[PDB]
Amino acid sequence: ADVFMVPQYGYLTLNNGSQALGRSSFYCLEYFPSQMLRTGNNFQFSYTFEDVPFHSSYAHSQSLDRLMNPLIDQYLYYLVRTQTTGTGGTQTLAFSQAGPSSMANQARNWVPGPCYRQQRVST
Amino acid sequence: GADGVGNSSGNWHCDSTWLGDRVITTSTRTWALPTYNNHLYKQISNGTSGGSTNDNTYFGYSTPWGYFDFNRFHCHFSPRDWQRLINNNWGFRPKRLNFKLFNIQVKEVTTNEGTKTIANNLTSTVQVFTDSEYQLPYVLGSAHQGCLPPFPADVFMVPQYGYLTLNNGSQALGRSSFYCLEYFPSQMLRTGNNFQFSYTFEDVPFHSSYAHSQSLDRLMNPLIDQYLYYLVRTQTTGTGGTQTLAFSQAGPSSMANQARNWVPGPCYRQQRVSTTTNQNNNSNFAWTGAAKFKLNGRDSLMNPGVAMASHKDDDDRFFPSSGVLIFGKQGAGNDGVDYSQVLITDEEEIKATNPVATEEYGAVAINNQAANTQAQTGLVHNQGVIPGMVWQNRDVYLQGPIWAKIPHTDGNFHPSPLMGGFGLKHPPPQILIKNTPVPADPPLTFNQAKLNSFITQYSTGQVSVEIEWELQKENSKRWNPEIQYTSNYYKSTNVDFAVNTEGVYSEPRPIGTRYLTRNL
Amino acid sequence: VDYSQVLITDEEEIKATNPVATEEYGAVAINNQAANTQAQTGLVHNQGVIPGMVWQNRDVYL
Amino acid sequence: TGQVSVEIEWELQKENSKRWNPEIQYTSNYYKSTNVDFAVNTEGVYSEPRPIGTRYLTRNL
Amino acid sequence: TGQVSVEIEWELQKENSKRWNPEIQYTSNYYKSTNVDFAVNTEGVYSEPRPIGTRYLTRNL
Amino acid sequence: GADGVGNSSGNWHCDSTWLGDRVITTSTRT
Amino acid sequence: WALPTYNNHLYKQISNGTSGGSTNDNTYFGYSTPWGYFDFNRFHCHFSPRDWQRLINNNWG
Amino acid sequence: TTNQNNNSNFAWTGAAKFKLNGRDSLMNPGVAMASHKDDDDRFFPSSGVLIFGKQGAGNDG
Numbered sequence A: 001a002d003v004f005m006v007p008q009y010g011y012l013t014l015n016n017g018s019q020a021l022g023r024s025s026f027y028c029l030e031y032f033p034s035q036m037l038r039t040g041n042n043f044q045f046s047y048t049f050e051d052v053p054f055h056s057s058y059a060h061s062q063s064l065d066r067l068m069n070p071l072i073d074q075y076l077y078y079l080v081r082t083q084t085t086g087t088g089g090t091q092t093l094a095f096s097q098a099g100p101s102s103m104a105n106q107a108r109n110w111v112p113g114p115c116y117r118q119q120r121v122s123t
Numbered sequence B: 001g002a003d004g005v006g007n008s009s010g011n012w013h014c015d016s017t018w019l020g021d022r023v024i025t026t027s028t029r030t031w032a033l034p035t036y037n038n039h040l041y042k043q044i045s046n047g048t049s050g051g052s053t054n055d056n057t058y059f060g061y062s063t064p065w066g067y068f069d070f071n072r073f074h075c076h077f078s079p080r081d082w083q084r085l086i087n088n089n090w091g092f093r094p095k096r097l098n099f100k101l102f103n104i105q106v107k108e109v110t111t112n113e114g115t116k117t118i119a120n121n122l123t124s125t126v127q128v129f130t131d132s133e134y135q136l137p138y139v140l141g142s143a144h145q146g147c148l149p150p151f152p153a154d155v156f157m158v159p160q161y162g163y164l165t166l167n168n169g170s171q172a173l174g175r176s177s178f179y180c181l182e183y184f185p186s187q188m189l190r191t192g193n194n195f196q197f198s199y200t201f202e203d204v205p206f207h208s209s210y211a212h213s214q215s216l217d218r219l220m221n222p223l224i225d226q227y228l229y230y231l232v233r234t235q236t237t238g239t240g241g242t243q244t245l246a247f248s249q250a251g252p253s254s255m256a257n258q259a260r261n262w263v264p265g266p267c268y269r270q271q272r273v274s275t276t277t278n279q280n281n282n283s284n285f286a287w288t289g290a291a292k293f294k295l296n297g298r299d300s301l302m303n304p305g306v307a308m309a310s311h312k313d314d315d316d317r318f319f320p321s322s323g324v325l326i327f328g329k330q331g332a333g334n335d336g337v338d339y340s341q342v343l344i345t346d347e348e349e350i351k352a353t354n355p356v357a358t359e360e361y362g363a364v365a366i367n368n369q370a371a372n373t374q375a376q377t378g379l380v381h382n383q384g385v386i387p388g389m390v391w392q393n394r395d396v397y398l399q400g401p402i403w404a405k406i407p408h409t410d411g412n413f414h415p416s417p418l419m420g421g422f423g424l425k426h427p428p429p430q431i432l433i434k435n436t437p438v439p440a441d442p443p444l445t446f447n448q449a450k451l452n453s454f455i456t457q458y459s460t461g462q463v464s465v466e467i468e469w470e471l472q473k474e475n476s477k478r479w480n481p482e483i484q485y486t487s488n489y490y491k492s493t494n495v496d497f498a499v500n501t502e503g504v505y506s507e508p509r510p511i512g513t514r515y516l517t518r519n520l
Numbered sequence C: 001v002d003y004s005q006v007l008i009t010d011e012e013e014i015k016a017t018n019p020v021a022t023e024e025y026g027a028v029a030i031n032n033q034a035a036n037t038q039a040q041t042g043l044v045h046n047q048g049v050i051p052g053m054v055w056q057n058r059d060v061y062l
Numbered sequence D, E: 001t002g003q004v005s006v007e008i009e010w011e012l013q014k015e016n017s018k019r020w021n022p023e024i025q026y027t028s029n030y031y032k033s034t035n036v037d038f039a040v041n042t043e044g045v046y047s048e049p050r051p052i053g054t055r056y057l058t059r060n061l
Numbered sequence F: 001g002a003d004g005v006g007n008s009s010g011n012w013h014c015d016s017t018w019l020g021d022r023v024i025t026t027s028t029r030t
Numbered sequence G: 001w002a003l004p005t006y007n008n009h010l011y012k013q014i015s016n017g018t019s020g021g022s023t024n025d026n027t028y029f030g031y032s033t034p035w036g037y038f039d040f041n042r043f044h045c046h047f048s049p050r051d052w053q054r055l056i057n058n059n060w061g
Numbered sequence H: 001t002t003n004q005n006n007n008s009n010f011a012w013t014g015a016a017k018f019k020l021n022g023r024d025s026l027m028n029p030g031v032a033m034a035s036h037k038d039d040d041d042r043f044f045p046s047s048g049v050l051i052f053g054k055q056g057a058g059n060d061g
């Protein structure tokens, strides 16, 4: 129902401060073949979107980390300890097969996406 | 007859055939299926509460179903075959496969007064079906045990299927999804009944069986000098110490200075650890030391990390704490096993194009040089991809993984499984099997309850996986003999990759893929 | 304008594959472990793309 | 002044999920209120009460 | 003992509404819980948490 | 053979399919 | 729609300077034209709230 | 300009580099980046641009 105002066109060019550079380009719309109308005159056209990937309307139901069966244990080992447990405190190499209980340790084929730190703020 | 009880419903095919590029592998093993979860879907969660940490929390379900996994190279390749493939090809990749289930036999076990007897239930059935539409959580590619045995003779147990869903602590979220296998059109079998299908691998890049014979840095002719200059000095030599700009053409002698078109691959710093006990610092830094990525407030270990050289030359003892695959020696214990039991793989072959795992990527200037201020530089421990980088993917081993399902995500980069292998969007479908519940006699008067009593039984049968691989022959004009995997002549009490005196096949070491050398 | 006027969108749906906005990506070792020297690790606040990553694009709204 | 017309053809991609339990979905709460969501108010001012996402349906990883 | 199979073909009648605002719809609440709605519990006992009606979509009189 | 003891005398169909108006339900229980 | 006359039928040079209160990061150089433009780049234009609902609640993309 | 630069031979120590196989090689000519922000024309990356000798120029120093 609402009736709206048409936005004004304007553009930006390379600038240093409040000055323009040699490169900066000035466009004149009138230098464009445009069609004219009088009432009882109409304009129209058609365009076809280049092929683009479907937007994802689906939210995952498995975390990237939790991609493996709980029941089974990986055939691969990880370094579980650099030092002997208890009083002795002498360096040793201990290896364990990542299991269901030790989920965090187990190896994965995929890792999380990229990130740029964003400052946190509370409502 | 077509399908009867006194009739082999399939044969044993265990052969490898080489013609031209195409090498065909065929394996057959004898499996046994136990009843799982008493024919019950069970909710399984690990809580925040109790000893367990927050990073090991999860929510999911354990199903009464078993699954067939062949995702390990040793299944389709004899050690001798792995040798032929590694020692003469610059690459290879899967093309198509063929699966078969047959000679299914279902046994019903009875126990009275400490007397146990196992006989046949012929009328009993076994359900099978393939997740051809990928509607079921993908188990495979998680390096889980339960794949066909390496040795053909061995008889193996079928892995139990179970999956994970979004969780907070020991709780599920609204999003988390519960799947019922029975809600899947599955085919049923009675002995003399057989199942089978075929799949064709989507096109994938040939794995690299070749190790570079030129470093990325050393890509230029020694004799010639570059037509380009570099800034060689900021200050006059000797006593004067007055700033000046001197430029030199990078030559053969000054190789490091000269400009290059390509730069090394990406790196995530990996803590270094030495096989020798004494060298290592006396702290349990296995976890605190190790690099990790934090997702959804939970820190998971970066295993096995991006592909990086295990060590710089002569640092053979060194390895990343989490940055390489590790394979247990046969008979090795699951928990807290000694170093001797484990086989730590080594990815040094790729050192030429990839960064060393334990060292910085390099250095970058931290500030603008000033008339008063001195130039500064900072180390790069974490380095992401940038234009001009080139790198090598992590190697696969005779007992490594083969493929992995690329997560259905909006985007990803160089989706080659980090544990090594071929990244497929539509990998070989998960094959699900289950013994059909056979109820114990019901009570005489109708009960609204669901039957909780069943005859105890398990099933057994042969399985056949046949895969057609496409090879990519070597074209090298290298004049000298190349390095190759061989078995040492010198005598020993046991033969490599054979059964021992007890009948226990054992894989003495991991076997890489890159022996043949190709130019950069 | 006051907070009440604004509608702050929420992209938590993608938390499963994407890093939390306010937290580090994770940690990397800063030095080689030594017989005398202790292992060290540093946080990753800025993390670029590397082989093996997967992620979700930002959502669109009505 | 004049009318303008934009017509767009969108291609959908149906759900294939075998999820057994009910999925989450955008709904308008039953509980009474003085104004209707996404309607004009007593003055004739359409208003968009909240942002509306796109991902409600769940798919596996 | 044996298996039984019932297959039924249902005929739908799509919605034609020109209602401008979002309609009410059956959804599963996001907020966390120890068990999932319409799933098996820790013991293997599927349970139907509530009755589920048929009328959510609204049509004129 | 057509009908024998060592032969599945039927399969498990538990699927739902939506095309146009027609929605097809299929259930199998033991 | 309604179209006002823009810039008195004039192309005008517009710049924001370093000088004065404005910072350096808000400096710019450009031009404002006597032309107007039609923009439909917002989802709500083509979708009724009810329609947005149907699309979100039943499609994976 | 000679005077502006700090009085040290930081040609190598200063410069960014990538370490491969235990050997540090200079990052020349680096990723593609702007040589200077406006009016910083005198400035250049120590190793971050191509350099061509004037004809008859000497190879060393």
Ligand SMILES: Nc1ncnc2c1ncn2[C@H]1C[C@H](O)[C@@H](COP(=O)(O)O)O1
Pocket (backbone or CB within 6 Å): B204, B205, B413, B414, B415, B416, B417, B421, B422, B423, B424
């Ligand atoms: N193993 C494996 N599986 C799937 N996708 C892969 C694999 N290795 C590389 N890639 C990626 C890398 C590119 O994005 C693309 C092939 O392009 P190209 O120019 O040929 O590298 O596929």
Ligand SMILES: [Cl-]
Pocket (backbone or CB within 6 Å): B328, B329, B330, B331, B332
């Ligand atoms: Cl083992």
Ligand SMILES: [Cl-]
Pocket (backbone or CB within 6 Å): H053, H054, H055, H056, H057
């Ligand atoms: Cl010259």
Ligand code: NA
Pocket (backbone or CB within 6 Å): B037, B042, B044, B062
């Ligand atoms: Na269990």
Ligand code: NA
Pocket (backbone or CB within 6 Å): G007, G012, G014, G032
């Ligand atoms: Na103006």
